[model samples]
Target: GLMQFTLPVRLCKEIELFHFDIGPFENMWPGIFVYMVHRSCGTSCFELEKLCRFIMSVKKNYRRVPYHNWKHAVTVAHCMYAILQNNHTLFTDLERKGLLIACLCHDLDHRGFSNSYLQKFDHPLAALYSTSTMEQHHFSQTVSILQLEGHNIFSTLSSSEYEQVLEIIRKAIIATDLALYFGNRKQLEEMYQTGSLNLNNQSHRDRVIGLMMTACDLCSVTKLWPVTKLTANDIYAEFWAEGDEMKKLGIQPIPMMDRDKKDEVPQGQLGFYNAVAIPCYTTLTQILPPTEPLLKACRDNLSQWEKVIRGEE
Candidate 1:
């Protein structure tokens, strides 16, 4: 026999009706994250289901702006998946899960603008946290989402398993700091020169994992040819528009858009692709053969853009 006691029968019935319906109750981040992980892993059905539930819970209360929306999560997840494939047999199941989760949740509550904008406005988020950028706050929020007592995501895992998950998550999340970009690149160069990737080293696995995640983060160059071109144009338009908005707001506009005579669109992109993005991925592909296709895609796209710029297309 069921005994019902509530101030209002209608409210009680509504609550009971939605008890098991977690979809409408939770946020969307966890769901989107899980979807991307499942797409990337290809054989993690059980884990995928768990991730989906987590993402949905996250989405319920966390709203992100354009730059850090679900699409960005999907993009990074897809990129990580590609990187993992390129470096197949390099990660354990645990490491893969951590990497997927990190990429999926890195930008959970991004505000669309850069950290510079946030700092200038004296945003409460910037004051509450003392990191160089909003990405740090976003990462902290992700871990908090799962760490609070009732919200613990690793509650079902064994102690050792939980520790491993936390460690991996921490390492991957910390690596997402864009401020570490130049430092990471320098470290990679140093490692390459020393030929320190010998399989006998115990730290080799960590090195590979970190490199793979960083590569995925820097994977804009690896997108399909047409997609890469379209994204480049979109990014240019966004930056230019933001610069215009800053001017209207009486703020110092971002560099590269301060001058009327500057044509920093396609040329700047070409320079970056040819100089930085190209060499980095080209070398990365040597260690991970699967990335060759991505490098080729970038090269092909750059060529097309060059031709178009010269009115050859």
Candidate 2:
């Protein structure tokens, strides 16, 4: 109760309800993380208060973007939680925490606009990585938040352990970058489907962590048709907003990002499903059988999207 003063009343109220009450009734994100993080980590090493405080800082740090905000972070973290619960010990204990934290922070401080838009603007964030500019910022912000005193959620770790966890968080967050994923995915796609994924091998395991984070990040595509359509609307709202900014500067935004290209979005979504969403979930299901239904939903959503595109014709 005393610590609740540090955050907004509403935020703390939700946190307090979880820290004290055991019920989710609605399972507001507040309820999920308290138990999810606690249950997943299941350790004397983590200080529960520190964990929740760090979580509060996470939500506070996330930028107010339509597509990637606090809610998006919570959703990805839950994806990791369910994935772990479904396949216990598939990932190690330390790596599990790292994966969950990385999931929670993968798109930390997303600026609504993506890396390309920022690159064109010659933003400082773009300076960090010529290719993976935004994701690098996400990784940088994740480390920066941990630098603050109360925000050290992994406080109990020894020095070496701290660095190790940070490495996982670093790669895991960077792994979500489509730029990196595009190149890294081929090797993984080959391994998972061909039955060559040997988790005991460090390279194979690390790649799975990388692949898993992408799957988690893109999980929204696997939702019901109504939910999938709404996410498209929300994401396109942000995509077109950035293009609006570009237009005000008298530059031509790419077709997909351009508001006038709204006509092409149904077709665009179909392309996305074909290239990224279906392939990603397909590879993930080959490894994690529990998530196969997600792949099924993606196929279903793809068909639903085709109907929309058909109607457009």
Compare the candidates by TM-score and give the number of the best one.
2
Candidate 1 residues 244-274, lDDT tens each?
A: 7667768878565454524656677687777
For model 2, residues 116-222, the per-residue Cα lDDT tens digits are 78877889877868877888888888988888888787777889998999998888888888877776678987876687879899878778888788888887887
Q: Provide the global lDDT of candidate 2 against the true structure.
A: 0.77
Q: Give the top-scoring candidate (lDDT).
A: 2
List of clashing residue pairs for candidate 2: 24-27
Off by over 4 Å in 2: 1-27, 43-45, 193-195
Tell me the whole-model lDDT of each prediction, alpha carbons only: 0.60, 0.77
Could you give the C-alpha RMSD of every candidate to the true structure, in order shown? 10.3, 5.7
lDDT of candidate model 1 versus the reference? 0.60
Error of 1 at 201 (Å): 5.2
